[PDB]
Write the C-alpha cells for this entry.
Amino acid sequence: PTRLTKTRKHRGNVSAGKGRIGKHRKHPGGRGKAGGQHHHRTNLDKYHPGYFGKVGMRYFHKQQNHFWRPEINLDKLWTLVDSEKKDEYLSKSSASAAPVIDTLAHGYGKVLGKGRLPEVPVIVKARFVSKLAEEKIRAVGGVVELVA
Amino acid sequence: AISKNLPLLNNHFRKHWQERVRVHFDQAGKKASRRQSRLRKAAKIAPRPIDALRPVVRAPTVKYNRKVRAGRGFTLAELKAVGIAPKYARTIGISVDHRRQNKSQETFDANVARLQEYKSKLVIFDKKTKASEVASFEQVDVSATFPVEQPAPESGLRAVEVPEQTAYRTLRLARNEKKYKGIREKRAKEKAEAEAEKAK
Amino acid sequence: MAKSGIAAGVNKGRKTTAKEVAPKISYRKGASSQRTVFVRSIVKEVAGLAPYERRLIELIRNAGEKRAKKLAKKRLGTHKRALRKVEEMTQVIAESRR
Amino acid sequence: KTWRRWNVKVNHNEKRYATASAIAASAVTSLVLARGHRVEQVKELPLVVSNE
Amino acid sequence: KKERLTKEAAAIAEGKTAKDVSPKPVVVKYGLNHVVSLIENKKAKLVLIANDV
Amino acid sequence: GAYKYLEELQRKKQSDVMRFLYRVRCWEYRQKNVIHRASRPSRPDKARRLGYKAKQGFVIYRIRVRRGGRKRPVPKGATYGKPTNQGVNQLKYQKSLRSTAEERVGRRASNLRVLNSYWVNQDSTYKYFEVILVDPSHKAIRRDARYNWIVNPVHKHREARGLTSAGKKSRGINKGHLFNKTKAGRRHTWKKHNTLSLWRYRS
RNA sequence: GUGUAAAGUUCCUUCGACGAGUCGAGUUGUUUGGGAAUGCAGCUCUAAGUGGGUGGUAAAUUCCAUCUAAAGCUAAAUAUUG
RNA sequence: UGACCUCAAAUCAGGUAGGACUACCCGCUGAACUUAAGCAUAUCAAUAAGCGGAGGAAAAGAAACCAACAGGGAUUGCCUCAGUAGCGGCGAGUGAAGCGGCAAAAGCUCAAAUUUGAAAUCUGGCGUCUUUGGCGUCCGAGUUGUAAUUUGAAGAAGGUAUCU
Ligand SMILES: [Mg+2]
Ligand SMILES: [Mg+2]
Ligand SMILES: [Mg+2]
Ligand SMILES: [Mg+2]
Ligand SMILES: [Mg+2]
Ligand SMILES: [Mg+2]
Ligand SMILES: [Mg+2]
Ligand SMILES: [Mg+2]
Ligand SMILES: [Mg+2]
Ligand SMILES: [Mg+2]
Ligand SMILES: [Mg+2]
Ligand SMILES: [Mg+2]
Ligand SMILES: [Mg+2]
Ligand SMILES: [Mg+2]
Ligand SMILES: [Mg+2]
Ligand SMILES: [Mg+2]
Ligand SMILES: [Mg+2]
Ligand SMILES: [Mg+2]
Ligand SMILES: [Mg+2]
Ligand SMILES: [Mg+2]
Ligand SMILES: [Mg+2]
Ligand SMILES: [Mg+2]
Ligand SMILES: [Mg+2]
Ligand SMILES: [Mg+2]
Ligand SMILES: [Mg+2]
Ligand SMILES: [Mg+2]
Ligand SMILES: [Mg+2]
Ligand SMILES: [Mg+2]
Ligand SMILES: [Mg+2]
Ligand SMILES: [Mg+2]
Ligand SMILES: [Mg+2]
Ligand SMILES: [Mg+2]
Ligand SMILES: [Mg+2]
Ligand SMILES: [Mg+2]
Ligand SMILES: [Mg+2]
Ligand SMILES: [Mg+2]
C-alpha cells in the first residue's frame, strides 16, 4: 500500500529525503555494473572477490542430465522403507529376510555415508555408493547391490 | 552504480521490453473455452472415446530411466503381434508410431498386453447395430481407463548375500578399466606384433 | 545380457532382454541396384571424364599417388572423398591396360 | 500499466486455516451480533434446519 | 479404336472374352520412356531416332 | 525410362557433351530477353522432379539474373554511422539468386502461382533459371486433386514470402540443433524469447 | 447398389528405381549462445552409392549410433492497440 | 501441295493480376540516440524507419530430428530447463537447446517403373439435360509422357491359405 510508504511522510519537506547538497540525480557513478574496475573497485574487491577473470575449462553443449545424481545419506536411508512396515522390519530383519531399499526408484543416484544406521540388515540398491557408506551398511549385516 | 554487500543481478531489461509484455488476463476465460471445446468434441462423436489409446514408453536419458510415460503410438511390430493393421488401427482409436522400434522385450510386452486389454473391451458397431445398443454405452476416458502405471519399486524382504568384492571396489575397477582400455589395447597390440613379428 | 548391469565402466547400463529388430527399408538407402549400375555405366560412356579427372589419371600413371591425393582433395574438398576418387581413377586405368 | 499485479497468492493451508476459523466464529453469538446480524431471536447457534 | 471397342462390346454381349474377336496387335512402338525400356529388355528389333530432338 | 539417363547425364556437367551444350544454350539464352517464356522445359526430368506436369496450366519461364554480391546502395559510399557499418563492398544478399529469379518471374506473370524453379546454366555475369508456374484459374488445375492446393489463397505469391524450396532454404527452415534460431521462423523465435510472460498469480 | 469388382490380411522367392552447380570444401561478408567458424548469402572448386548428413574442439586412422537432404500438402492447441 | 519447331498479331473465345486496411503473420533491408560513467569491438538491435507478400489465423509440420538412455519419436504453445551451457574490450552486457509436466493431436503426396493386347488422361467449342455439374460429339493438349499403379512406415512382380 502507498499510504504506508515514506513518500507520504516526505510531503511538505523540500528534498524528499534526498538531501540539499547531493541533489538526487539521474545516474552518478554510471549504470549497472559500470566502473567495476575503476571507481567501484573498492566495492567489488571487498564484497565480490573473484569477480573478474577466467577459471577452469569451458564445456561446449553441457547437458545437465548427464550429471544427475541426487545424494541420500545413511541417516536418511530408512525413510525410504514403507512407513507402515518400518517398525516390523526393524524387529524381524535378519540375514534370511532383510528389507530391500531401491534408492534409484526413489530418485537417488548415490548413497553417501553420513550418520548411523540401525543395527539391522538391509539390502540397498544404488547406482553409486561411497566407500564409507558401504562399509557401514556391511557392518550392520547388510549389502549394497549395484544397479543401473 | 555498485553499492553495498548485495548480490550482483542480471536483469535483462535493456531492450524495448514493454512492447512485448504478455499478461495472461485470459487464463480463466481460456480455461472455460477450452472446457467447452472439449465438451463439443466429446458430444460430436459419443460414445466413441475422445482419446486414442497411447503406448507406454521409458523416458530417455540417465535422469529419467526410472520413469515410464505415455508414448506417441504403438509400433508396427506391437500391432503386428495383436493382428491389427496400422491403417485399420488408426480407425479404432489406436495410435500408431512408425518411428519407434522395440530393441528390448519389456516395453514390447507391456504394450502388447495394453493393446490386448484395449482390444477385449472394444465393441465395433456396424449397420446391423441399432441406436438402442449404441445408447447402452457411455463415453469412457481412455487415458483413465488404461492409465500409465509406474512399475513398483522393489521392496520387502530378501536374503542377504555379500560378495567378497565390495560394490565400491567394483565401481572403481569398472572406471579404471574404461579409462585405460584404449591404451592397454594399443600396448597389447604393439606387444603382440613385436613378440610375434621378430619371432617369425 | 548386453549391458554390464552397473552404472560405470565399459558397456555400462541396465541389462534388458534383447528383441530382434526388423531392419527398416530406409536403411537400404546407400545400397546399389541393377538399374542404377546399368544407367551409370552407359552415361559414363556417353559423357566421359571431367578435366580434373583426366589430370588425376596422369598423376596416377606417373606414379604420383601422393600427388594425386593432394589434387583430389583440393578438387573434391575432403580427404575421404579424395581417397574414393583416386581409387576410382586407378580402376579406370586398370580397365585401360587390356 | 496493465502488468501491475492484480491477483495475490495465499498459501492453500493458510486459506483453509482461515476458512475453518470463520466457520468456527459463525457459532459464537457475540461475534454474530457484533457482525450486525439480527439473530437475537434465534435460540442457539449453530442454527440447523431440517432437510425439507 | 472406337470401331474395335464397338466390336468388343458386341462380343461381350455374346458372352465371349473379347480377346478372341480382336487379333493381337502388331504396331510401331513410340514414346521415349517406352522405347528405352523396350531396348533395355532386348525387345526392340529396330529403333529409329529423330535427328532434331 | 529415359528420365534416369537424363538425371545421370546432367550430373556430368564437366563432360565434353554437357560443356558444349552449356556453351551453346548460354549464348542463346543471353541473346533473348532477361525474362522470356520457355516453350518447354530444357530439362524435362528436372521439371518432373519439382512437380511439373505436361498439362495445360503448367508454364515455364526462363530468367537471367546478375551474379555477385549486393553493393550497399548508399550515395558515394558514406554510411553515416559507426565503423562496423561502413562496409559497402563484399556485402551479400540474404536471398539466393534462385529466389530473385522466382520473384521477378512471379511478378511478371502475376496471374500464375510460382510452383518451383531450377538452375539451367551459368556464365560470369548471369545465372539462368527456369521457373515452373501453375495457372490457378485453369480448370485442368482446379479439377486436379493433386494441385487444387495451390488455388487456395494462402499460396498467393508464395515465392515472395519464402515458401518455395529456395525461400525455405534461405529462411533456415530445417530440423535440428543447427537451426535453433530459425527453425520456426527467426523473428517469431526472437519475439517468443524476448516476451515477458506474466501470469495472474505471479511465480 | 452393374461389388465374379475394390481394399486389407498370412507365408515364400526374385527384386527394391529413392531428387546435382546439389551435398560437401575453401574463402569473403553478415549473423548466432554456437566457441579452429550456428545459419544465410556471394565467388571458386565440385561429388558418391551402404552412399550421404548429423553426433557442439581443428586433423588422420578405426569403429559405433541415428536419420535419409537437395521435390510437395496438411486441422488443433498459439498470436491478435485492425 | 502439306507437316513440324520457334516466334508474332487480333477490340480473337474465356479468364486472371494490380489497389485498400494494420493489431497479429511471412520475408528483405536497416540505423542512430542510448549503455559502456570517455570511446572505436560490443550494446541498443538481428529493434525503429523503408520495401515485397498473406490469412482468419499466418508460419512450422510428419525427421537427412533428439539423443547416448532400459532410449524417445511430425509441428506449435505454456511451465520448467535457465539468467543456465555458452558468447563477451571475458568489460558493460548477453544467452539458447535436449530431457520432464501439460494444452492440442492427424496424417500423408509426388519424381525416379513398359498401359504397350491398344493415352486407358485432360481444357475448350457445339448439342442436350435434373446445371457448384452429367451425358453425347468434334477439334485441341499430350508420347520431349496425360491416367491407373508405388513413396521407404515401404513397396513391386510371381506364387500363396483362405478369410475380413
Ligand atoms: Mg528536516
Ligand atoms: Mg515549497
Ligand atoms: Mg533518504
Ligand atoms: Mg533541491
Ligand atoms: Mg559536493
Ligand atoms: Mg549523492
Ligand atoms: Mg555477468
Ligand atoms: Mg531408436
Ligand atoms: Mg543407409
Ligand atoms: Mg563451369
Ligand atoms: Mg547510418
Ligand atoms: Mg529423397
Ligand atoms: Mg543485414
Ligand atoms: Mg560464419
Ligand atoms: Mg559458403
Ligand atoms: Mg520433405
Ligand atoms: Mg506448407
Ligand atoms: Mg489477447
Ligand atoms: Mg480484436
Ligand atoms: Mg476478347
Ligand atoms: Mg498491394
Ligand atoms: Mg541492423
Ligand atoms: Mg532509449
Ligand atoms: Mg557512452
Ligand atoms: Mg554519461
Ligand atoms: Mg559521446
Ligand atoms: Mg544484433
Ligand atoms: Mg518497421
Ligand atoms: Mg480477407
Ligand atoms: Mg485457431
Ligand atoms: Mg498453412
Ligand atoms: Mg518420410
Ligand atoms: Mg517432437
Ligand atoms: Mg543479442
Ligand atoms: Mg514433453
Ligand atoms: Mg466436351
